Amino acid sequence: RKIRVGLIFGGKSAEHEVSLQSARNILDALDPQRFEPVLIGIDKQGQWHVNDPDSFLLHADDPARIALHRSGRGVALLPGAQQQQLRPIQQALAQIDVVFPIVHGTLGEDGSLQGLLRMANLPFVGSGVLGSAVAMDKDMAKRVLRDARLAVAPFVCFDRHTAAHADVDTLIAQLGLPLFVKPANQGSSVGVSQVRTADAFAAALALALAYDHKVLVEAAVAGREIECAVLGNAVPHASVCGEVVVEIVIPADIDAQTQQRIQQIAVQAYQALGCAGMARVDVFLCADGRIVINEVNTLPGFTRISVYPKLWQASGLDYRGLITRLIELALERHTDDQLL
Amino acid sequence: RKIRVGLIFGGKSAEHEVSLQSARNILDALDPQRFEPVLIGIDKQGQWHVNDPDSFLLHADDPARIALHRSGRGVALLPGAQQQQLRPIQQALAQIDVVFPIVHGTLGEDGSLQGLLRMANLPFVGSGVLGSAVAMDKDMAKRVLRDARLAVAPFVCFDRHTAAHADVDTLIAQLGLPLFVKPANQGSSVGVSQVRTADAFAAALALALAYDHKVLVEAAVAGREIECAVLGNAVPHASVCGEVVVEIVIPADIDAQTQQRIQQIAVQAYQALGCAGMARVDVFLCADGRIVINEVNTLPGFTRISVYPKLWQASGLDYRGLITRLIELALERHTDDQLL
Ligand SMILES: Nc1ncnc2c1ncn2[C@@H]1O[C@H](COP(=O)(O)OP(=O)(O)NP(=O)(O)O)[C@@H](O)[C@H]1O
Ligand SMILES: Nc1ncnc2c1ncn2[C@@H]1O[C@H](COP(=O)(O)OP(=O)(O)NP(=O)(O)O)[C@@H](O)[C@H]1O
Ligand SMILES: [Mg+2]
Ligand SMILES: [Mg+2]
């Protein structure tokens, strides 16, 4: 009755090395009374490799050099299999009971991996196909958030076939300056430009369009940057808040009343987008102080030093306890999903 | 240079037999100058079976008895494989170049299958992960539609953990009677109740909740039922309209001006939800005549007698031509998706 926990990690992402460290840390905090790990790493090229727990990493202890051991032990997925759904090309691999996916990159976060795991009838930690796909698409997300009567930065969304037409003056007239230019579909922090003058705009648009088919152009939100951790499925709970300064400060220096209402905004956002298990919600806090949601991230960091587990720590939930709860959440959802 | 077309069909769905007939028909219309088929059928239990084109079906010609030949030739999916991503358990299976998925049921339509196909770097016909997941979730869909300033039936959405609280009088006060009660997440036509009096309501809610975690309760829309076919990705086109009477009449008996604007509504809806390749949009036409969107279906029927190909036929696009275009759409999207 010890449950097998399939950790899937890595990916073609700038955040590849973060996923490595995340997997390392989850491994060390995994309650050994309840869980045995199975290690599946994805290299920067997209190739899947099974590993042994003591030899998944190269230069594990050098963060400038840390790398996946490409063991070349390949993976087969048996679509509609009910048992041993993940199989080795080449002898046998422990039955996996729950997948903890921490694959950064487009496919790991956009509901694509989640669909593959659904197709294999595997319980898995985090948002399902819908919540992942919607939260990842910033344009879709903000539109769902806005409809839920939550505040988002005002914005316009262009594609390739409409960007060619962009009128800068009308944008500046509508949205002001600076303008934040971003791809909708993330892998993000890439293609994000603060355009300060009208002349910078054309180039920001082009850069963003190198990374996605849709690009958002938002007005500036003046206000402090608060991050709030969310956990659970049906009745989500919110961590204490954390403030970003440019350096993260936890617990953020704000009112209990302003904290309480950022917590409720975070929960309402999490529910509008249909998230599960976990999310980090990043908002802006205005002088007003209105609260404007910047981002809902369905795949937060899981290193010891990552903001998400740090926020929960500061809320009286430790790293071990977090991991275990995320696993239980994944199993509860799977068994409710089972019946219907 | 003949391209291999992986037809994936069947599924645990009441619409299983429709998917069978769809696959039969697509097979016969597949341009033999351009395409060779590969047949993968999914039985009512979820098991995948490869078949030969002349022996995929049992009782092919008896629609009361038509069934999948469960050849027991199983399928392996090689996650992150770039070549032979679909492999046989047991000798070899033609390289698939594009998948035409027509799997009815929750997994085939909700973006789950789509994610599995994305994970295997396979081009595929129809909406991607986001468009499928969003259009399938009727609650999410209507919220995105509403935000796009398109009219949807007014409605309330309950889950299991909030249905217990439902106030019928307030609902009738808000929404009127009859009330249409439906699961959000389809496989749908199941769990749909017209509740005529306040007493019928409790039982409709329970039934719907047997089939999904969310259930919509909508006001009645009085108005004629029009269906409109949509095709393409970036610049979608709309078929002539078709009227539902209770018997489908094509071309619907309406104004060219009312048709033109249902066509634009269909396109705007298709774009707001982020659909690709194909959809059937079902609207209501009011006396007014406002247009209210009932449904956007990302997986329409593909038998000869199915409304979607019939609508295009009536628009000067034949069945062969439809299939081929859907394939080209799938390849164009895949190669644009390739770069970013
Ligand atoms: N509309 C806006 N108004 C004011 N500041 C913004 C706005 N959009 C982005 N920023 C700032 O730019 C940063 C990056 O934008 P964000 O959408 O968070 O990008 P990301 O791709 O998710 N990468 P990360 O910086 O890791 O979040 C934010 O943390 C803010 O400091
Ligand atoms: N709000 C409403 N107002 C008026 N009629 C409705 C409403 N909702 C549904 N109907 C009617 O009920 C039918 C079924 O609802 P619909 O959402 O189309 O279900 P479905 O699960 O997609 N199955 P199908 O009937 O095949 O579409 C519609 O075609 C209409 O005739
Ligand atoms: Mg952010
Ligand atoms: Mg309908």
JSON list of C-alpha atoms in Angstrom, two decimals, chain A residues 12 42 45-48 75-82 87 89 106-108 110-116 118-119 121 129-130 133-134 137 140 142-144 146-149 159-161 185 209-214 234-235 271-274 333 336-337 339-340, chain B residues 12 42 45-48 75-82 87 89 106-108 110-116 118-119 121 129-130 133-134 137 140 142-144 146-149 159-161 185 209-214 234-235 271-274 333 336-337 339-340:
[
{"chain": "A", "resi": 12, "resn": "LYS", "atom": "CA", "xyz": [12.47, 22.07, -23.30]},
{"chain": "A", "resi": 42, "resn": "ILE", "atom": "CA", "xyz": [12.53, 14.84, -20.23]},
{"chain": "A", "resi": 45, "resn": "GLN", "atom": "CA", "xyz": [15.08, 17.92, -26.98]},
{"chain": "A", "resi": 46, "resn": "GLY", "atom": "CA", "xyz": [11.81, 16.33, -25.71]},
{"chain": "A", "resi": 47, "resn": "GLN", "atom": "CA", "xyz": [13.08, 12.80, -25.12]},
{"chain": "A", "resi": 48, "resn": "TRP", "atom": "CA", "xyz": [11.85, 10.86, -22.09]},
{"chain": "A", "resi": 75, "resn": "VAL", "atom": "CA", "xyz": [8.97, 5.40, -22.30]},
{"chain": "A", "resi": 76, "resn": "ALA", "atom": "CA", "xyz": [5.82, 3.99, -23.94]},
{"chain": "A", "resi": 77, "resn": "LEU", "atom": "CA", "xyz": [2.38, 5.13, -23.05]},
{"chain": "A", "resi": 78, "resn": "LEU", "atom": "CA", "xyz": [-0.44, 2.71, -23.51]},
{"chain": "A", "resi": 79, "resn": "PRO", "atom": "CA", "xyz": [-3.49, 4.80, -24.48]},
{"chain": "A", "resi": 80, "resn": "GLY", "atom": "CA", "xyz": [-6.59, 3.43, -22.74]},
{"chain": "A", "resi": 81, "resn": "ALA", "atom": "CA", "xyz": [-4.50, 0.99, -20.68]},
{"chain": "A", "resi": 82, "resn": "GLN", "atom": "CA", "xyz": [-5.84, 0.58, -17.17]},
{"chain": "A", "resi": 87, "resn": "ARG", "atom": "CA", "xyz": [5.91, 1.02, -20.07]},
{"chain": "A", "resi": 89, "resn": "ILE", "atom": "CA", "xyz": [10.71, 0.36, -24.50]},
{"chain": "A", "resi": 106, "resn": "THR", "atom": "CA", "xyz": [4.66, 24.73, -23.48]},
{"chain": "A", "resi": 107, "resn": "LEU", "atom": "CA", "xyz": [3.61, 21.07, -23.55]},
{"chain": "A", "resi": 108, "resn": "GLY", "atom": "CA", "xyz": [4.05, 20.44, -19.81]},
{"chain": "A", "resi": 110, "resn": "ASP", "atom": "CA", "xyz": [-0.68, 23.94, -21.51]},
{"chain": "A", "resi": 111, "resn": "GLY", "atom": "CA", "xyz": [-2.86, 20.90, -20.80]},
{"chain": "A", "resi": 112, "resn": "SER", "atom": "CA", "xyz": [-1.11, 18.78, -23.39]},
{"chain": "A", "resi": 113, "resn": "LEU", "atom": "CA", "xyz": [0.80, 16.58, -20.87]},
{"chain": "A", "resi": 114, "resn": "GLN", "atom": "CA", "xyz": [-2.37, 16.55, -18.75]},
{"chain": "A", "resi": 115, "resn": "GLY", "atom": "CA", "xyz": [-4.37, 15.16, -21.64]},
{"chain": "A", "resi": 116, "resn": "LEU", "atom": "CA", "xyz": [-1.77, 12.49, -22.24]},
{"chain": "A", "resi": 118, "resn": "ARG", "atom": "CA", "xyz": [-5.83, 11.51, -18.74]},
{"chain": "A", "resi": 119, "resn": "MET", "atom": "CA", "xyz": [-5.68, 9.27, -21.78]},
{"chain": "A", "resi": 121, "resn": "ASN", "atom": "CA", "xyz": [-6.12, 6.93, -16.79]},
{"chain": "A", "resi": 129, "resn": "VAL", "atom": "CA", "xyz": [-6.74, 19.95, -19.18]},
{"chain": "A", "resi": 130, "resn": "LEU", "atom": "CA", "xyz": [-9.09, 22.96, -19.09]},
{"chain": "A", "resi": 133, "resn": "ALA", "atom": "CA", "xyz": [-4.92, 25.33, -21.09]},
{"chain": "A", "resi": 134, "resn": "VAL", "atom": "CA", "xyz": [-6.94, 28.41, -19.96]},
{"chain": "A", "resi": 137, "resn": "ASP", "atom": "CA", "xyz": [-3.32, 31.31, -22.44]},
{"chain": "A", "resi": 140, "resn": "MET", "atom": "CA", "xyz": [-8.15, 33.64, -22.64]},
{"chain": "A", "resi": 142, "resn": "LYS", "atom": "CA", "xyz": [-7.83, 37.58, -18.64]},
{"chain": "A", "resi": 143, "resn": "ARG", "atom": "CA", "xyz": [-11.08, 37.36, -20.60]},
{"chain": "A", "resi": 144, "resn": "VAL", "atom": "CA", "xyz": [-12.37, 34.67, -18.20]},
{"chain": "A", "resi": 146, "resn": "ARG", "atom": "CA", "xyz": [-12.71, 39.88, -16.52]},
{"chain": "A", "resi": 147, "resn": "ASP", "atom": "CA", "xyz": [-16.03, 38.08, -17.03]},
{"chain": "A", "resi": 148, "resn": "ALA", "atom": "CA", "xyz": [-15.79, 36.92, -13.44]},
{"chain": "A", "resi": 149, "resn": "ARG", "atom": "CA", "xyz": [-15.76, 40.65, -12.58]},
{"chain": "A", "resi": 159, "resn": "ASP", "atom": "CA", "xyz": [-2.17, 37.86, -33.88]},
{"chain": "A", "resi": 160, "resn": "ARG", "atom": "CA", "xyz": [0.26, 37.70, -36.83]},
{"chain": "A", "resi": 161, "resn": "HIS", "atom": "CA", "xyz": [-2.62, 38.34, -39.23]},
{"chain": "A", "resi": 185, "resn": "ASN", "atom": "CA", "xyz": [1.09, 31.54, -24.40]},
{"chain": "A", "resi": 209, "resn": "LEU", "atom": "CA", "xyz": [5.39, 37.24, -32.35]},
{"chain": "A", "resi": 210, "resn": "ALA", "atom": "CA", "xyz": [8.55, 35.15, -32.69]},
{"chain": "A", "resi": 211, "resn": "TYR", "atom": "CA", "xyz": [7.42, 33.22, -29.61]},
{"chain": "A", "resi": 212, "resn": "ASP", "atom": "CA", "xyz": [3.63, 32.88, -30.04]},
{"chain": "A", "resi": 213, "resn": "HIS", "atom": "CA", "xyz": [0.72, 33.38, -32.46]},
{"chain": "A", "resi": 214, "resn": "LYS", "atom": "CA", "xyz": [-0.91, 35.86, -30.03]},
{"chain": "A", "resi": 234, "resn": "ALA", "atom": "CA", "xyz": [-13.24, 22.07, -4.54]},
{"chain": "A", "resi": 235, "resn": "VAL", "atom": "CA", "xyz": [-12.49, 24.31, -1.65]},
{"chain": "A", "resi": 271, "resn": "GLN", "atom": "CA", "xyz": [-12.12, 28.96, -9.47]},
{"chain": "A", "resi": 272, "resn": "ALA", "atom": "CA", "xyz": [-13.09, 31.08, -12.48]},
{"chain": "A", "resi": 273, "resn": "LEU", "atom": "CA", "xyz": [-10.26, 29.48, -14.51]},
{"chain": "A", "resi": 274, "resn": "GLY", "atom": "CA", "xyz": [-11.04, 26.03, -13.17]},
{"chain": "A", "resi": 333, "resn": "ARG", "atom": "CA", "xyz": [-9.98, 14.13, -8.13]},
{"chain": "A", "resi": 336, "resn": "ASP", "atom": "CA", "xyz": [-14.46, 11.52, -8.40]},
{"chain": "A", "resi": 337, "resn": "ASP", "atom": "CA", "xyz": [-13.59, 11.70, -12.10]},
{"chain": "A", "resi": 339, "resn": "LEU", "atom": "CA", "xyz": [-17.56, 7.51, -11.69]},
{"chain": "A", "resi": 340, "resn": "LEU", "atom": "CA", "xyz": [-18.69, 10.12, -14.28]},
{"chain": "B", "resi": 12, "resn": "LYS", "atom": "CA", "xyz": [-17.03, 5.08, -24.99]},
{"chain": "B", "resi": 42, "resn": "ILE", "atom": "CA", "xyz": [-11.35, 2.52, -29.78]},
{"chain": "B", "resi": 45, "resn": "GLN", "atom": "CA", "xyz": [-14.24, 0.02, -22.92]},
{"chain": "B", "resi": 46, "resn": "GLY", "atom": "CA", "xyz": [-11.44, 2.42, -24.06]},
{"chain": "B", "resi": 47, "resn": "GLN", "atom": "CA", "xyz": [-9.16, -0.13, -25.71]},
{"chain": "B", "resi": 48, "resn": "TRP", "atom": "CA", "xyz": [-7.34, 0.82, -28.92]},
{"chain": "B", "resi": 75, "resn": "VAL", "atom": "CA", "xyz": [-1.21, 0.72, -29.67]},
{"chain": "B", "resi": 76, "resn": "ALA", "atom": "CA", "xyz": [1.82, 2.35, -28.00]},
{"chain": "B", "resi": 77, "resn": "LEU", "atom": "CA", "xyz": [2.43, 6.04, -28.04]},
{"chain": "B", "resi": 78, "resn": "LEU", "atom": "CA", "xyz": [5.98, 7.23, -27.80]},
{"chain": "B", "resi": 79, "resn": "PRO", "atom": "CA", "xyz": [5.86, 10.53, -25.89]},
{"chain": "B", "resi": 80, "resn": "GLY", "atom": "CA", "xyz": [8.32, 13.00, -27.43]},
{"chain": "B", "resi": 81, "resn": "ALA", "atom": "CA", "xyz": [9.05, 10.62, -30.34]},
{"chain": "B", "resi": 82, "resn": "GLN", "atom": "CA", "xyz": [9.54, 12.47, -33.59]},
{"chain": "B", "resi": 87, "resn": "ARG", "atom": "CA", "xyz": [3.73, 1.92, -32.47]},
{"chain": "B", "resi": 89, "resn": "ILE", "atom": "CA", "xyz": [2.55, -3.62, -29.12]},
{"chain": "B", "resi": 106, "resn": "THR", "atom": "CA", "xyz": [-15.36, 12.91, -22.97]},
{"chain": "B", "resi": 107, "resn": "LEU", "atom": "CA", "xyz": [-11.71, 12.11, -23.68]},
{"chain": "B", "resi": 108, "resn": "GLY", "atom": "CA", "xyz": [-11.95, 12.40, -27.49]},
{"chain": "B", "resi": 110, "resn": "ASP", "atom": "CA", "xyz": [-12.31, 17.60, -24.26]},
{"chain": "B", "resi": 111, "resn": "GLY", "atom": "CA", "xyz": [-8.74, 18.26, -25.39]},
{"chain": "B", "resi": 112, "resn": "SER", "atom": "CA", "xyz": [-7.42, 15.14, -23.71]},
{"chain": "B", "resi": 113, "resn": "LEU", "atom": "CA", "xyz": [-6.87, 13.16, -26.96]},
{"chain": "B", "resi": 114, "resn": "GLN", "atom": "CA", "xyz": [-5.57, 16.38, -28.53]},
{"chain": "B", "resi": 115, "resn": "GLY", "atom": "CA", "xyz": [-2.96, 16.72, -25.82]},
{"chain": "B", "resi": 116, "resn": "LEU", "atom": "CA", "xyz": [-1.89, 13.13, -26.32]},
{"chain": "B", "resi": 118, "resn": "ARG", "atom": "CA", "xyz": [0.46, 17.04, -29.30]},
{"chain": "B", "resi": 119, "resn": "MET", "atom": "CA", "xyz": [2.74, 15.12, -26.99]},
{"chain": "B", "resi": 121, "resn": "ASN", "atom": "CA", "xyz": [4.21, 15.71, -32.29]},
{"chain": "B", "resi": 129, "resn": "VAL", "atom": "CA", "xyz": [-6.23, 21.55, -26.59]},
{"chain": "B", "resi": 130, "resn": "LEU", "atom": "CA", "xyz": [-7.64, 24.95, -25.57]},
{"chain": "B", "resi": 133, "resn": "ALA", "atom": "CA", "xyz": [-11.44, 21.96, -23.67]},
{"chain": "B", "resi": 134, "resn": "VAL", "atom": "CA", "xyz": [-13.22, 25.38, -23.66]},
{"chain": "B", "resi": 137, "resn": "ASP", "atom": "CA", "xyz": [-17.14, 22.97, -21.09]},
{"chain": "B", "resi": 140, "resn": "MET", "atom": "CA", "xyz": [-16.68, 28.11, -19.59]},
{"chain": "B", "resi": 142, "resn": "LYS", "atom": "CA", "xyz": [-20.80, 30.64, -22.45]},
{"chain": "B", "resi": 143, "resn": "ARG", "atom": "CA", "xyz": [-18.70, 32.82, -20.15]},
{"chain": "B", "resi": 144, "resn": "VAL", "atom": "CA", "xyz": [-16.12, 33.31, -22.93]},
{"chain": "B", "resi": 146, "resn": "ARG", "atom": "CA", "xyz": [-20.64, 36.40, -23.15]},
{"chain": "B", "resi": 147, "resn": "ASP", "atom": "CA", "xyz": [-17.36, 38.28, -22.63]},
{"chain": "B", "resi": 148, "resn": "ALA", "atom": "CA", "xyz": [-17.04, 38.46, -26.40]},
{"chain": "B", "resi": 149, "resn": "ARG", "atom": "CA", "xyz": [-20.36, 40.36, -26.27]},
{"chain": "B", "resi": 159, "resn": "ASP", "atom": "CA", "xyz": [-21.59, 22.06, -8.67]},
{"chain": "B", "resi": 160, "resn": "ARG", "atom": "CA", "xyz": [-22.22, 19.16, -6.25]},
{"chain": "B", "resi": 161, "resn": "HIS", "atom": "CA", "xyz": [-20.97, 21.29, -3.36]},
{"chain": "B", "resi": 185, "resn": "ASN", "atom": "CA", "xyz": [-19.25, 18.81, -19.82]},
{"chain": "B", "resi": 209, "resn": "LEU", "atom": "CA", "xyz": [-25.07, 15.71, -11.41]},
{"chain": "B", "resi": 210, "resn": "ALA", "atom": "CA", "xyz": [-24.81, 11.99, -12.09]},
{"chain": "B", "resi": 211, "resn": "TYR", "atom": "CA", "xyz": [-23.07, 12.85, -15.36]},
{"chain": "B", "resi": 212, "resn": "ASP", "atom": "CA", "xyz": [-20.82, 15.83, -14.48]},
{"chain": "B", "resi": 213, "resn": "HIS", "atom": "CA", "xyz": [-19.43, 17.91, -11.60]},
{"chain": "B", "resi": 214, "resn": "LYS", "atom": "CA", "xyz": [-21.09, 21.05, -13.04]},
{"chain": "B", "resi": 234, "resn": "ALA", "atom": "CA", "xyz": [-6.97, 31.79, -39.07]},
{"chain": "B", "resi": 235, "resn": "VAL", "atom": "CA", "xyz": [-9.69, 32.91, -41.37]},
{"chain": "B", "resi": 271, "resn": "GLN", "atom": "CA", "xyz": [-12.67, 32.72, -32.77]},
{"chain": "B", "resi": 272, "resn": "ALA", "atom": "CA", "xyz": [-13.54, 33.75, -29.21]},
{"chain": "B", "resi": 273, "resn": "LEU", "atom": "CA", "xyz": [-13.30, 30.08, -28.10]},
{"chain": "B", "resi": 274, "resn": "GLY", "atom": "CA", "xyz": [-10.16, 29.52, -30.14]},
{"chain": "B", "resi": 333, "resn": "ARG", "atom": "CA", "xyz": [-1.29, 24.48, -38.15]},
{"chain": "B", "resi": 336, "resn": "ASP", "atom": "CA", "xyz": [3.21, 27.05, -37.89]},
{"chain": "B", "resi": 337, "resn": "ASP", "atom": "CA", "xyz": [3.18, 25.44, -34.44]},
{"chain": "B", "resi": 339, "resn": "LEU", "atom": "CA", "xyz": [8.67, 27.03, -35.30]},
{"chain": "B", "resi": 340, "resn": "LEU", "atom": "CA", "xyz": [7.40, 28.52, -32.00]}
]
